[PDB]
Amino acid sequence: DTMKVINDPIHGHIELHPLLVRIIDTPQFQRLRYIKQLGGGYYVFPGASHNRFEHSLGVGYLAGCLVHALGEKQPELQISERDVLCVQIAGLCHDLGHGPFSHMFDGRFIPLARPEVKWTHEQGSVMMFEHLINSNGIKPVMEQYGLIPEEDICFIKEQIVGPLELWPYKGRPENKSFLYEIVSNKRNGIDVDKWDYFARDCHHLGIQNNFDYKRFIKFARVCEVDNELRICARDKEVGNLYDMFHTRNSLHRRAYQHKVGNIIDTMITDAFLKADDYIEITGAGGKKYRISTAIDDMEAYTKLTDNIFLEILYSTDPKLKDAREILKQIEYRNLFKYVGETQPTIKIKREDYESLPKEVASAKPKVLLDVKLKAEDFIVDVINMDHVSFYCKTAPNRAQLIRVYCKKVDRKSLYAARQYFVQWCADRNFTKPQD
Amino acid sequence: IHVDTMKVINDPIHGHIELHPLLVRIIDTPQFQRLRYIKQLGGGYYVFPGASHNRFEHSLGVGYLAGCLVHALGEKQPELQISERDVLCVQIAGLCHDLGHGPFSHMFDGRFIPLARPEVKWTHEQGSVMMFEHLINSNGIKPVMEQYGLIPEEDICFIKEQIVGPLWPYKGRPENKSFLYEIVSNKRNGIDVDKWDYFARDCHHLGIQNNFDYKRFIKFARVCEVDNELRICARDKEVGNLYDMFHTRNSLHRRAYQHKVGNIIDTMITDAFLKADDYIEITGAGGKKYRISTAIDDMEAYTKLTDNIFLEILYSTDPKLKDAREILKQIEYRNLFKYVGETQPTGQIKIKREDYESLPKEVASAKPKVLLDVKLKAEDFIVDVINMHVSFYCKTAPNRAIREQLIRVYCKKVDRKSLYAARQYFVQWCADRNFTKPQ
Amino acid sequence: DTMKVINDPIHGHIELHPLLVRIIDTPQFQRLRYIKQLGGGYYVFPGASHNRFEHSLGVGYLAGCLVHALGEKQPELQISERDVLCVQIAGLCHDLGHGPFSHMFDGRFIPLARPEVKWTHEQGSVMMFEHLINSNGIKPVMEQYGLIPEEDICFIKEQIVGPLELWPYKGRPENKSFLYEIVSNKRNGIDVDKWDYFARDCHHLGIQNNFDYKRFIKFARVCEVDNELRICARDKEVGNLYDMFHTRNSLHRRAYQHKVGNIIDTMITDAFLKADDYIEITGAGGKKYRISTAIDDMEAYTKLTDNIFLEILYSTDPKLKDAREILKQIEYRNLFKYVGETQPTIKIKREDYESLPKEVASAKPKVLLDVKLKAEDFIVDVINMDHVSFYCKTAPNRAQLIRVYCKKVDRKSLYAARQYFVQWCADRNFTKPQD
Amino acid sequence: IHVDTMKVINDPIHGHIELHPLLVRIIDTPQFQRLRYIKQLGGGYYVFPGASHNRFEHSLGVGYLAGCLVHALGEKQPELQISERDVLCVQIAGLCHDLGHGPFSHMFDGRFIPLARPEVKWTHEQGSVMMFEHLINSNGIKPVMEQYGLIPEEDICFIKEQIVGPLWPYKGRPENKSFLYEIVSNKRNGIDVDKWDYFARDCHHLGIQNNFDYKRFIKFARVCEVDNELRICARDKEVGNLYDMFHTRNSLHRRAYQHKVGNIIDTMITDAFLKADDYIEITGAGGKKYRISTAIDDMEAYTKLTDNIFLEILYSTDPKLKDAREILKQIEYRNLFKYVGETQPTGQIKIKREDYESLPKEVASAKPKVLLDVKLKAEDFIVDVINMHVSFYCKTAPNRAIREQLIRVYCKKVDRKSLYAARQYFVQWCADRNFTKPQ
Ligand SMILES: Nc1nc2c(ncn2[C@H]2CC[C@@H](COP(=O)(O)OP(=O)(O)OP(=O)(O)O)O2)c(=O)[nH]1
Ligand SMILES: Nc1nc2c(ncn2[C@H]2CC[C@@H](COP(=O)(O)OP(=O)(O)OP(=O)(O)O)O2)c(=O)[nH]1
Ligand SMILES: Nc1nc2c(ncn2[C@H]2CC[C@@H](COP(=O)(O)OP(=O)(O)OP(=O)(O)O)O2)c(=O)[nH]1
Ligand SMILES: Nc1nc2c(ncn2[C@H]2CC[C@@H](COP(=O)(O)OP(=O)(O)OP(=O)(O)O)O2)c(=O)[nH]1
Ligand SMILES: Nc1nc2c(ncn2[C@H]2CC[C@@H](COP(=O)(O)OP(=O)(O)OP(=O)(O)O)O2)c(=O)[nH]1
Ligand SMILES: Nc1nc2c(ncn2[C@H]2CC[C@@H](COP(=O)(O)OP(=O)(O)OP(=O)(O)O)O2)c(=O)[nH]1
Ligand SMILES: Nc1nc2c(ncn2[C@H]2CC[C@@H](COP(=O)(O)OP(=O)(O)OP(=O)(O)O)O2)c(=O)[nH]1
Ligand SMILES: Nc1nc2c(ncn2[C@H]2CC[C@@H](COP(=O)(O)OP(=O)(O)OP(=O)(O)O)O2)c(=O)[nH]1
Ligand SMILES: [Fe+3]
Ligand SMILES: [Fe+3]
Ligand SMILES: [Fe+3]
Ligand SMILES: [Fe+3]
Ligand SMILES: [Mg+2]
Ligand SMILES: [Mg+2]
Ligand SMILES: [Mg+2]
Ligand SMILES: [Mg+2]
């Protein structure tokens, strides 16, 4: 009641502990106001204007409510006041590392710009979180409220990215193992992160959200399973869960995998690439970095947001003329044309993403072709497709898609790109159809 | 353009919105797509995290609602002579009404420009007229208008009049279809599709409920003769719906638009724009260079003027921008101007746009009752100016008619000493410029 | 988690303590399934089919959530596990005493049938609650879970009806005074009872419900005010409260005061009256009671529900022919015709309700009348119209309508009833208009 | 009946519903108003307290949706020759489709009547036809039909066919408007306004969300030629909406309609009706006396047969009703039949309506592997029978076509000894009548 309250459209009023407020009001956190949640989705769904910032607030809030709910119903667990804060901090900072247009950056751009590099936004989040506390002297404030930084910061990072190095976690002992299933749950993909963006994306997409997370948390319990401590749902809650997965399927099919949405995101990527050489971002020690290299220094990365889209678009510099023209095509709605899609029966690896258009253009279609295509005329889009145990009332504590687009939009040539593609699919024997 | 073959855009408020190809042609332009880059509530976003929405989706909504209103009237009252041409012209009017808005919306024409160019009289509504002209000229929309049966010389004027008013005063349409001018912007009773959309839209993002059901209201809407003039009438039963709209508007103004911290942030951003104006160049027509404040004079530069300017100052390295850049960071670090108080000129004269620049000086020159260990210059004061009839029909007689200013003060110095000093400069200034004694 | 869960459309899942379940599964509680919430409103609003039963569950649930929320945030209050149950029981049973078509019964019918009698449904609730525990042996079960019946039952009754006899309450001491503001709050009309039926009636009427009760309870605090302990709202919650009152105004104006709705309810009352003599309900000791007398014996009253409407309607008995014809008029939608409405500047007392039609018909309108009316041709409907202190963040713990309808529906005579009415209003100088 | 002068009824699902005077005349009858007194989900109410809604409001909804569908088609596809007369006939069909339902809805025709009169083949759909005939005859609706341009002999048949099917098989309308028969009741693909309404309605009261947007689906609905037959087609883009409807139906069947306790209660009430049938008299035509089970033979008695019969047994003093009355109290006291188990005849033959009476006897006659200290008669067993293609069009080619049984067992004796005894009678009976081994 001495805390901060932020009014939220999804969760209503979210009360924020002073320590969380201190972290949020920094350049490194406020940065997330400037990155669209659904990336290019906005250019298909006008309601999807929401950014990573409000999402981060949501996951942190939900993070806090889960730990708190469990601890009261099971004092056995030895959940400390310190633990609750640490889970909340993990929730708030889990997406700190996302780049321009979110999943476009680490999912396509960086692979294309630096196939060499193994990079995900989660490690960005770890790196950016470390940068945040040092730049703003959060560690004293952490100590002030009863947290021990050496132990807890490790815990915080582990909740986001997983084990940093029989029991892999250095930040917390096995007896509070259930904490690591809260913010990021790899072991079935059930956690508060996704609960939030479901409700959140649905709200902004005008899609009904099916899963009642308030209820699920209320009935949530910690049970022993295979002599490991983990979070378990009431038997009656299965219907709720059937339903969460159905909301998920709807979001992935209608929104995240949208044909035009993904095209636009690849156009933006193509634009970033022809601008990469000429754009300068100032990092630590006044050093100069490019878009693709900005991930190497967290000072520079902080200033890398959706802003780069407009900065390229508004630029007069003729070095950027090539990049600028693509973005202008988006405005005029002259977009890459959709050729087709296929799935492999093994999956394409991201270090292979760069190599793919050459392969597509270099195939030899059986049928004679009226016009021939270079590799520069193809865009190939790699779209990656993504148990639970229960407890009973009467007895508690017992249990890839690949698209190809063509840059040329005349009818005759569009039919050329067609045949290169059908051949390419067949000859790396990915599936043969469709019509 | 045969029905059912249109483009459909899915919207969280209105559901699926159908777009005539001509509307689509206007939408798919740099001048239109620009609104994707301007936040609806401006600095409001920094208080309400759900209020991330931009002018773009709002404008689409008003265009859609515009269409639903005239179409509904035309179908149930054929005497009115509502043409498909009229329908399109009303939709285009709805769609482009906010084209002229600048960075952070109302912050721009409502505060910045008055502060930057006090002699100039400028509103975003006339911006919208200018930008619409630039849009149709740059992209050759006029042939397409003719293509679908519109007469550009006559209709473009109609479109502009529906937005900003008369340039019988209206040249764009005859008096016999006068009721059309009550759809997009209704000056008399303030009930129109513009208000309807942003009421519902802002509510959605603010997590505020909307009690006005516009779908219903349009269904029962009628045009009747009033004082020998044609006007839009609501069924008597719809009064309850109207009670709800005004309560929604009252809540939004009091809870959201007049929010203290929201407005503080809006003034800080304005303060930042001012000390940056000299050093920032935007390229206009003929390659000419303009500044933020002069960009409204040339639509070519203005097209490239959006919320982007906030981040540009922010990300800037130039030490000329050191004064501005540091202020924006205070926003990031959440070290903001502190709220001293509020007062109203009740029964008195209202501050004029030509006097905004002059206001902080007057405040700083006051004579505080007890003298303070701290004395404050004019540069440390901020003064914020916040600015605050239906005819019916009954069923049995379907065509017969029936029937503030706030000023706040913030201080740039929030050290304990200056703050209570800042208190009495304000209280004294209020006493001596005839405002209510603050509380 | 060993409790019962009932799924509710307004509140979601409501968990019920075993003791509450024991009380609910009795003829005396289950009775409320058979009484419509809005009475004659259903015949205007097809969505308002809901009954007192589900409403009672709601108020009990909300009752429990308020006490529980306060006790955790202020352990100072000395709220016992026993107290929480007692507030919940009060919530669940507060409407036990309502009769057929709810407010029609005690608000019009009983006054007309027995003007002599001073009767409200709240005392019914007290009487019916007492009858419930004795008939079903609840007192042992009460003792079983740690309740002391002599002390607590008094507390329970006091929360519903007020003081039974400086400090008026015998059931609880002044230091837990705040408990009496939860289920029924006379001292500003702010309590959980109304919170529920707002949300509930709104849901079924298709009216938006403005008040967020979940939030209000979350921020609710107990403060000292005028050296009496009472419940206080956060300063920020004023906007929420402005809003509760606006929802209230909407419900009263659009629904509860509906012109046709009230007419129908008076028609039903008129029907009950001409049936009252001939209908037999079996009470204690096999004794026979009538509709108006059924309130005297709780055994008989238990079997008095909306059922009486259909029993009259379906009857063959010619003694009931007079009553039956009125009900049949409702089906054919031949209803009392609306003459007009007025308010007094002093209010009509319910012991005077019976006397009113005689007065209306006996006036002498200045203008000459073409047809004259008996008292039997008039229906006069009496519709009764219905501070808060706060606390701050930084410093906790510091602060009648009267309608006249006419039974005859020809144009000439309808205009007669008109003039009797205008005269009657003027000559007991209630307001003169309207047009 | 000029538009905008109709009667409007406010509905929680559809908002305001407009009613043509002819529809109103039908609605304001004892035969129609009767549905106010029959619970939609029957015994479901005793598990879901929010499910208090009755057949009345549901029927109004289907009538409204019926109107929205044909009207939408008629406006966007004038070739189809949809008349205002057709519109009314479809609305009346929608409105009266559930007239024939009895006490607790599906409990009556789905369980009771099979148990009470096993030789008789009866569904509420044919009830609806009978009751509609009784309605129009008793209240002289036929002149009013003629009054608004309807031809009673031709149209009343059409109305009946839209409900129960053929009495080209349809005499009520020619093959050229065949698509009309897919609106109220669609037998082939089960997508119609009936399902749409009660999906949305039940969801509202159960606190279950509805993912099918019917407002949208109707907007984009089209009639196309399919196999040289006229049928209703959805736009290809609407597939996602359809994914949502079926998931809603799947949830409702699994979560609500097939609820264990709900169904148990439905069988107890049925059990109560049976032992009361002999002693209860309902007055039919010519003053003749009928019982509950025979009331379906005469519409005069049936009009007075509603959920009221539940309370009548309950409130009854007659000791003849002692057997029934005590059962209902077990419901009040919540002492219910206990659930033994469930099994399915997967890949096997389905229980026939003529065999329901015979089923408990077969169960009781089984030979349990170990003999029990408790032995059970047939009167102590209850067996419950629970019973569980779209063409599209694409925008660029607007008129070209594209493309279980459960049986449960409950026991009336729930003493610990009888219950585990009851267990193996069931498991053995299942083994020896070829059902799945229970789990
Ligand atoms: N044209 C256009 N569509 C938008 C916009 N915002 C959202 N959308 C939605 C509407 C349709 C969807 C895809 O439209 P596109 O023009 O990109 O692609 P398309 O609809 O397949 O093109 P086409 O109609 O020629 O087949 O995106 C916008 O600003 N302009
Ligand atoms: N268009 C596009 N969408 C992607 C890509 N990769 C993932 N997505 C979408 C699909 C579902 C969604 C998954 O979101 P997450 O569960 O990872 O949650 P998040 O908030 O977005 O990120 P995080 O995991 O760090 O919390 O992201 C991509 O490469 N391109
Ligand atoms: N501090 C902070 N507040 C935010 C943020 N986003 C939205 N808000 C809303 C929630 C509360 C509201 C308070 O604004 P302030 O930070 O200026 O706090 P304050 O008004 O000066 O003081 P107080 O602590 O009493 O609220 O702003 C954010 O990122 N940081
Ligand atoms: N705090 C604050 N609120 C403002 C200011 N100017 C306007 N508002 C409020 C009043 C109504 C609300 C929305 O403005 P409008 O009603 O004019 O609607 P609009 O769509 O935003 O602009 P337009 O009139 O051009 O259509 O914003 C301002 O300067 N400060
Ligand atoms: N006629 C009728 N109206 C209903 C029914 N259910 C709800 N309503 C609503 C619709 C209108 C409202 C009042 O209708 P009434 O016929 O009782 O009174 P009225 O509408 O003022 O009559 P009138 O139209 O002649 O002025 O009640 C119903 O079953 N029949
Ligand atoms: N038609 C009609 N409505 C009435 C009458 N008296 C009261 N009402 C309505 C107006 C508002 C509503 C008030 O409900 P309450 O606050 O009393 O709550 P309740 O659940 O209905 O009863 P209780 O007070 O016992 O809890 O009842 C009446 O005499 N006639
Ligand atoms: N006991 C009871 N349950 C109700 C009532 N109203 C709705 N329900 C729902 C909520 C839970 C569900 C359980 O029904 P039962 O009472 O038969 O309980 P049960 O299924 O036999 O056993 P269990 O305690 O495990 O749920 O019924 C009610 O008034 N009393
Ligand atoms: N548990 C249970 N559910 C049933 C039974 N019969 C039907 N149901 C379910 C299946 C669908 C659901 C609603 O029935 P319908 O789809 O037939 O729609 P309706 O409006 O109720 O009746 P109608 O077909 O006459 O329009 O009720 C039954 O006997 N037992
Ligand atoms: Fe996330
Ligand atoms: Fe606007
Ligand atoms: Fe109540
Ligand atoms: Fe139906
Ligand atoms: Mg504050
Ligand atoms: Mg498309
Ligand atoms: Mg159960
Ligand atoms: Mg009316």
CSV table of N, CA, C and O in Angstrom, one decimal, chain C residues 118-162:
chain,number,residue,atom,x,y,z
C,118,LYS,N,-46.7,-5.2,9.9
C,118,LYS,CA,-45.4,-4.6,9.6
C,118,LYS,C,-44.5,-5.8,9.3
C,118,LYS,O,-44.1,-6.5,10.1
C,119,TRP,N,-44.2,-5.9,8.0
C,119,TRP,CA,-43.4,-7.0,7.5
C,119,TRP,C,-42.5,-6.7,6.4
C,119,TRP,O,-42.8,-5.9,5.4
C,120,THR,N,-41.2,-7.1,6.5
C,120,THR,CA,-40.2,-7.0,5.5
C,120,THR,C,-39.6,-8.4,5.3
C,120,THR,O,-39.6,-9.2,6.2
C,121,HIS,N,-39.0,-8.6,4.1
C,121,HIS,CA,-38.4,-9.9,3.8
C,121,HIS,C,-37.1,-10.1,4.6
C,121,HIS,O,-36.8,-11.3,4.8
C,122,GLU,N,-36.5,-9.1,5.1
C,122,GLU,CA,-35.3,-9.3,5.9
C,122,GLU,C,-35.6,-10.1,7.2
C,122,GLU,O,-34.7,-10.8,7.6
C,123,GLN,N,-36.7,-9.9,7.8
C,123,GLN,CA,-37.1,-10.6,9.0
C,123,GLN,C,-37.6,-12.0,8.7
C,123,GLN,O,-37.5,-12.9,9.5
C,124,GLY,N,-38.2,-12.1,7.5
C,124,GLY,CA,-38.3,-13.4,6.9
C,124,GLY,C,-37.0,-14.1,6.8
C,124,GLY,O,-37.0,-15.3,7.1
C,125,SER,N,-36.0,-13.5,6.4
C,125,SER,CA,-34.7,-14.1,6.3
C,125,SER,C,-34.2,-14.5,7.6
C,125,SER,O,-33.5,-15.6,7.7
C,126,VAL,N,-34.4,-13.7,8.6
C,126,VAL,CA,-34.0,-14.1,10.0
C,126,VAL,C,-34.8,-15.3,10.5
C,126,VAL,O,-34.3,-16.2,11.0
C,127,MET,N,-36.1,-15.2,10.3
C,127,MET,CA,-37.0,-16.3,10.7
C,127,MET,C,-36.7,-17.5,9.9
C,127,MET,O,-36.7,-18.6,10.5
C,128,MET,N,-36.6,-17.4,8.6
C,128,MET,CA,-36.3,-18.6,7.7
C,128,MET,C,-35.0,-19.2,8.0
C,128,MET,O,-34.8,-20.4,8.0
C,129,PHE,N,-34.0,-18.4,8.4
C,129,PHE,CA,-32.7,-18.9,8.7
C,129,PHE,C,-32.7,-19.7,10.0
C,129,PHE,O,-32.0,-20.7,10.1
C,130,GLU,N,-33.5,-19.2,11.0
C,130,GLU,CA,-33.7,-19.9,12.3
C,130,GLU,C,-34.3,-21.3,12.0
C,130,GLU,O,-33.9,-22.3,12.5
C,131,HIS,N,-35.4,-21.2,11.2
C,131,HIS,CA,-36.1,-22.4,10.8
C,131,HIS,C,-35.2,-23.4,10.1
C,131,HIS,O,-35.4,-24.7,10.3
C,132,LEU,N,-34.3,-23.0,9.3
C,132,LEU,CA,-33.4,-23.8,8.5
C,132,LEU,C,-32.5,-24.7,9.4
C,132,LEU,O,-32.4,-25.9,9.3
C,133,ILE,N,-31.8,-24.0,10.4
C,133,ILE,CA,-30.9,-24.7,11.3
C,133,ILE,C,-31.5,-25.7,12.2
C,133,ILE,O,-30.9,-26.8,12.5
C,134,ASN,N,-32.7,-25.4,12.6
C,134,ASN,CA,-33.5,-26.3,13.5
C,134,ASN,C,-34.0,-27.5,12.8
C,134,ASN,O,-33.9,-28.7,13.3
C,135,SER,N,-34.6,-27.3,11.6
C,135,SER,CA,-35.1,-28.4,10.8
C,135,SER,C,-34.1,-29.4,10.3
C,135,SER,O,-34.3,-30.6,10.2
C,136,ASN,N,-32.9,-28.9,10.1
C,136,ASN,CA,-31.8,-29.7,9.6
C,136,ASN,C,-30.6,-29.9,10.5
C,136,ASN,O,-29.6,-30.5,10.1
C,137,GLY,N,-30.8,-29.6,11.8
C,137,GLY,CA,-29.8,-29.9,12.8
C,137,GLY,C,-28.4,-29.3,12.4
C,137,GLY,O,-27.4,-30.0,12.5
C,138,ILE,N,-28.4,-28.0,12.1
C,138,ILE,CA,-27.1,-27.4,11.6
C,138,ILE,C,-26.3,-27.0,12.8
C,138,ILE,O,-25.1,-26.9,12.7
C,139,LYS,N,-26.9,-26.7,14.0
C,139,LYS,CA,-26.2,-26.3,15.2
C,139,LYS,C,-25.1,-27.2,15.6
C,139,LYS,O,-24.0,-26.7,15.9
C,140,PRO,N,-25.3,-28.5,15.6
C,140,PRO,CA,-24.2,-29.4,15.9
C,140,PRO,C,-23.0,-29.2,14.9
C,140,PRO,O,-21.9,-29.2,15.2
C,141,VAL,N,-23.4,-29.1,13.6
C,141,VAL,CA,-22.4,-28.9,12.5
C,141,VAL,C,-21.7,-27.6,12.7
C,141,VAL,O,-20.5,-27.5,12.4
C,142,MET,N,-22.4,-26.6,13.2
C,142,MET,CA,-21.8,-25.3,13.5
C,142,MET,C,-20.8,-25.4,14.6
C,142,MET,O,-19.6,-24.9,14.5
C,143,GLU,N,-21.1,-26.2,15.7
C,143,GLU,CA,-20.2,-26.4,16.8
C,143,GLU,C,-19.0,-27.2,16.3
C,143,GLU,O,-17.9,-27.0,16.7
C,144,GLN,N,-19.3,-28.2,15.4
C,144,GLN,CA,-18.2,-29.1,14.8
C,144,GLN,C,-17.1,-28.3,14.2
C,144,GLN,O,-15.9,-28.7,14.4
C,145,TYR,N,-17.3,-27.2,13.6
C,145,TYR,CA,-16.3,-26.4,12.9
C,145,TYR,C,-15.8,-25.2,13.8
C,145,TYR,O,-15.1,-24.3,13.2
C,146,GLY,N,-16.2,-25.2,15.0
C,146,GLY,CA,-15.6,-24.2,15.9
C,146,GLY,C,-16.5,-23.0,16.2
C,146,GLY,O,-16.0,-21.9,16.7
C,147,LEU,N,-17.7,-23.0,15.8
C,147,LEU,CA,-18.6,-21.9,16.0
C,147,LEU,C,-19.5,-22.1,17.3
C,147,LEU,O,-19.9,-23.3,17.6
C,148,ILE,N,-19.7,-21.1,18.1
C,148,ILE,CA,-20.6,-21.2,19.2
C,148,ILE,C,-21.9,-20.5,18.9
C,148,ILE,O,-22.0,-19.3,18.8
C,149,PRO,N,-23.0,-21.3,18.7
C,149,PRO,CA,-24.3,-21.0,18.1
C,149,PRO,C,-25.0,-19.8,18.8
C,149,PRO,O,-25.6,-18.9,18.2
C,150,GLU,N,-25.0,-19.8,20.2
C,150,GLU,CA,-25.7,-18.7,20.9
C,150,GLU,C,-25.2,-17.4,20.6
C,150,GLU,O,-25.9,-16.4,20.4
C,151,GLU,N,-23.9,-17.3,20.5
C,151,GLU,CA,-23.2,-16.0,20.2
C,151,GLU,C,-23.2,-15.7,18.7
C,151,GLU,O,-23.5,-14.6,18.3
C,152,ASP,N,-23.0,-16.7,17.8
C,152,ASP,CA,-22.8,-16.5,16.4
C,152,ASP,C,-24.1,-16.3,15.6
C,152,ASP,O,-24.1,-15.5,14.7
C,153,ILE,N,-25.1,-17.1,15.9
C,153,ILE,CA,-26.4,-17.0,15.3
C,153,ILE,C,-26.9,-15.6,15.4
C,153,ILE,O,-27.5,-15.0,14.5
C,154,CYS,N,-26.7,-15.0,16.6
C,154,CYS,CA,-27.1,-13.6,16.9
C,154,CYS,C,-26.4,-12.7,16.0
C,154,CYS,O,-26.9,-11.8,15.4
C,155,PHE,N,-25.1,-12.9,15.8
C,155,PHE,CA,-24.2,-12.2,14.9
C,155,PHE,C,-24.7,-12.3,13.5
C,155,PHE,O,-24.8,-11.3,12.8
C,156,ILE,N,-25.0,-13.5,13.1
C,156,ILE,CA,-25.5,-13.8,11.7
C,156,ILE,C,-26.8,-13.0,11.4
C,156,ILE,O,-26.9,-12.3,10.4
C,157,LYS,N,-27.8,-13.1,12.4
C,157,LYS,CA,-29.0,-12.4,12.2
C,157,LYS,C,-28.9,-10.9,12.2
C,157,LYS,O,-29.5,-10.2,11.5
C,158,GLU,N,-27.9,-10.4,13.0
C,158,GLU,CA,-27.7,-8.9,13.1
C,158,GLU,C,-27.1,-8.4,11.8
C,158,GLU,O,-27.4,-7.2,11.5
C,159,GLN,N,-26.3,-9.1,11.2
C,159,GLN,CA,-25.7,-8.7,9.9
C,159,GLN,C,-26.8,-8.5,8.8
C,159,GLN,O,-26.5,-7.8,7.8
C,160,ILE,N,-27.9,-9.2,9.0
C,160,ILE,CA,-28.9,-9.2,7.9
C,160,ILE,C,-30.0,-8.1,8.3
C,160,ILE,O,-30.3,-7.2,7.5
C,161,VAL,N,-30.5,-8.2,9.5
C,161,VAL,CA,-31.6,-7.4,9.9
C,161,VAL,C,-31.2,-6.2,10.8
C,161,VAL,O,-32.0,-5.2,11.0
C,162,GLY,N,-30.0,-6.1,11.3
C,162,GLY,CA,-29.6,-5.1,12.2
C,162,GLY,C,-29.8,-5.6,13.6
C,162,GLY,O,-30.2,-6.8,13.8
